[model samples]
Target: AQYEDGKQYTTLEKPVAGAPQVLEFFSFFCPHCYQFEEVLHISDNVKKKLPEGVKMTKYHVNFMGGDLGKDLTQAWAVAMALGVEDKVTVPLFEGVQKTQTIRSASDIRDVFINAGIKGEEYDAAWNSFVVKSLVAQQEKAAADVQLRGVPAMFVNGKYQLNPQGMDTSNMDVFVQQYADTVKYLSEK
Candidate 1:
């Protein structure tokens, strides 16, 4: 199969240059993103398979739940700041998409709290400059992409993945093909 521009990937209007990087824009409120995190495990699989020195950053999009979306994005930033992403991601995803229990940032704080993160630590991280800056950057990134949906991924900060060109006949093939495309684009 031939993977071409506009078919397998999209060239960003303004491309970035640096070491290879993959940016995934997702939302906790998105069911598909939940599947990608838990059911499919595409993010983890892709990360493990990526070339050395390739950086993968996941940005939580704040366009799903309006104000709650922004709050959720802040929650994600706090997770990143505290280095507790793995501890909180599944719970947050389940809380938001599966159980439908998360409604605000404080509710998200409870998830971390339950995970044994100190309340003061969560609160401090929530208001920390680093987390605030990260959240702002992520919001701008989503806007830069003019994103309209969740679970969108870009490779090398230049090419957005177009899944239609992928071989998605089955889960194994689909993940392998997706990883292959990401590897190719990251090196390009």
Candidate 2:
């Protein structure tokens, strides 16, 4: 989906409630998102320190070329439809980052298979209506949000973390700051 820079949030969909939200805007082919895995790891640590009602939600953006982004997006949407998002999120992320060989759709399916999701289930999930709907939803989100790049993040639909605005000279501090921002918003 295409997005116009600042308008995307205007039509942003409702997030899962009863939890402090961490929404990541990412694409599969984005090297930055891969590098940002460390940030997600930091997020896990930060979560332990946060009060209750806080959770992370990832929205996979498909702006990158080829079927890689689409395949991952479909995989995530299927997990959400199956009510197994929690089961699949971290595993999938780890799989993509760990297995440099799993670079294509087939490889992604293989990664899911290794993670215990069956081949048939993977196929079914890829074709599921819920997955299709999410693909459409992502398109809408892109057009509305006017996203400029991947690895962007929004906390509680109010605070945004764009790479341009971050102090990336220190990778650890940058990640910690992002986590701190989420913790602060989660409390409010």
Candidate 3:
């Protein structure tokens, strides 16, 4: 990312309407993305500090193929479609990449089941064509970033947060830089 042209985080040529959109591109299999959970204290500060009306979302990355990562990508998109992303996300990462507690899409279902989503309820949502289509959309979102990496974040589809390209010796500054960017865009 150092000495890269046009910044390590590229600007989106076409921005969108409504509040600023912060889309996090991540893969459950990436150790850095998994470490990010801890780096941000389970994203505790992120939830509290973002400017009001700034909407953050997630897109599951899927270039890692023929592995559990692929299944996990589809599983997360389905999780978002089911309105269970907040309920299932941390556990999914902790289970698969952290504790080795999950191995397939079926294992992911049980995580939701334990989170109070009835097994039958998720079964219907998981099998629906809508969920499949949403998964396709999520795949497209990841492709649009073209980073081929995880933990990438885009703000309002106009600016991407590129910490690696900046001087991040100070953790506070790193977090604040991202927050400031989001705040700046949220108000625009």
Candidate 4:
């Protein structure tokens, strides 16, 4: 892996199943996650560099927005269920971070609408058991990690990435190293 244990990543209390998977802990209100998408392009870049069969998932934390935070998380859960995560992420990020235009669940709906998702369709999925289940799982995962911050990455539910251990001076280097670490952990 060309990285040291506890330096680049720390092992989890107990490793969960789902190897070759990269799960990210992020939030719409987090400026760093916004930067990761807009400036660093971390998600896309790492996805591109990862070997085939590796699955990457993003979980929006519930601790950020309180009640509204869970609402946003529900919105994200719905987006994932609807297979529109790639479409809505940037717009949502822009809403909360850039423009401060998205302040409520209704505003999140507007963003989804802008992405061509109908209000009726969104409402259906939002109320469905699938979305609710996903939200519940996300909340449980958040609690399991006892996560303190956003933009955190974990591979196979075990190795959690520590940005301080990587070379972030150059964007390309950071992306390559990050992807490499994920690839290494996945193979373990």
**TM-score (all chains, Cα) for each model:** 0.92, 0.70, 0.79, 0.92
After superposition of all CA atoms, the RMSD between model 4 and the true structure is 1.7
After superposition, the stretches of candidate 3 with alpha carbons farther than 4 Å from their true spots are 1-9, 12-20, 41-49, 65-67, 185-188
- Tens digit of per-residue lDDT, candidate 2, span 123-184: 89788787899777666655555666887766666555544544779877766666665565
Least lDDT summed over 10 consecutive residues: which range in candidate 3?
1-10
Candidate 3 clash pair list? none
- Misplaced by over 4 Å in model 1 are 16-20
RMSD of each: 1.8, 6.7, 3.8, 1.7
Q: How many clashing pairs in candidate 2?
A: 12
lDDT of each: 0.84, 0.63, 0.69, 0.84
Report lDDT (Cα) of residue 181, candidate 2. 55
Please report how far candidate 2 places residue 113 from its true position, in Å.
1.1
Model 3 per-residue lDDT tens digits across residues 1-188: 33233554556666433422777777777787776665654244555667766566777777753567777776776788777777887888888777888877788778888888888878888788887887787777766656577777776666766667665787767666556555554454
Misplaced by over 4 Å in model 4 are 17-20
Q: At residue 154, what lDDT does model 3 achieve?
A: 72
Task: Please state the error at residue 179 of candidate 4 in Å.
Answer: 1.3
Model 3 gets an lDDT of: 0.69
